[PDB]
């Protein structure tokens, strides 16, 4: 069994920069995991933005930015808007499967 | 521009079984992978399967016996069907491209 953790939530301002991190349970996540990150806007709308662990989706503006920091992976925004308010979603390559976090809900004031 | 758009079927009844299709767009469903994602009203994503640009097809283990994703190549459909419905079923099913991630709109499955 694998969990995936995230923050619940988090909260910024705009300019500001914001780091979102994807982790494991079982242990360092790794390219092997192919880390995913996934923006839900309201009324269901799911957008990708990372792909590969850190490849921008062809879409994703380029302010979104993928990568592994230390045991986890990590979604960060280089100067943020209010329009990035949103839940951000990551899953996980177990190998065969793919696990989703929790979901970090981002507010922007 | 790529394009994914689930096409399933309205309310569903307990006992009975759901489909749905995806008709996927803008490239070759055998250079990618589709997966068959989904969330209960209010509450998390939660993977259901997937479908090898291959052929090969593998099923979150839990929902291993219910499920079978498929896929016309001619019609670019891909297909996938749970058995056995019930209450906690109803969500919005998804499915998504490989290699992107490139999401579908969804479509909210009740079940009365
Ligand atoms: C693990 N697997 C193979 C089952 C799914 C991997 O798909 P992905 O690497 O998450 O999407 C990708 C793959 C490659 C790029 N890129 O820029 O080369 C970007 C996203």
């Known amino acids: 069994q694998a969990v995936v953790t995230q923050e619940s939530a988090l909260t910024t301002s705009p300019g500001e920069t914001v780091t979102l991190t994807c982790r494991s349970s079982?242990?360092?996540?790794?390219?092997?995991?192919?880390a995913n990150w996934v923006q839900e806007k309201p009324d269901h709308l799911f957008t990708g933005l990372i792909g590969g662990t850190k490849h921008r989706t062809p879409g994703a503006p380029a302010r979104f930015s993928g990568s592994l920091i230390g045991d986890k992976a990590a979604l960060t925004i280089t100067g943020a808007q209010t329009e990035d308010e949103a839940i951000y979603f990551c899953?996980?390559?177990?190998?065969?499967?793919?696990?989703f976090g929790g979901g970090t809900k981002l507010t922007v004031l | 521009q790529v394009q994914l758009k689930e096409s399933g079927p309205g309310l569903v009844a307990p006992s009975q079984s759901l489909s749905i299709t995806c008709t996927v767009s803008g490239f070759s469903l055998t250079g990618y992978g589709v997966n068959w994602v989904r969330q209960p009203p209010g509450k998390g994503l939660e993977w259901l399967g997937m479908?090898?640009?291959?052929?090969?097809?593998d099923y979150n283990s839990a929902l291993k016996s219910r499920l079978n994703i498929s896929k016309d190549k001619s019609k670019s459909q891909v297909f996938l069907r749970m058995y056995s419905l019930q209450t906690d079923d109803t969500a919005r099913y998804y499915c998504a491209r490989d290699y992107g991630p490139y999401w579908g709109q969804g479509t909210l499955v009740t079940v009365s």
């Open positions: 079982t242990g360092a996540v790794t390219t092997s995991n192919y």
């Open positions: 899953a996980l390559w177990y190998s065969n499967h793919w696990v």
């Open positions: 479908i090898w640009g291959d052929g090969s097809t």
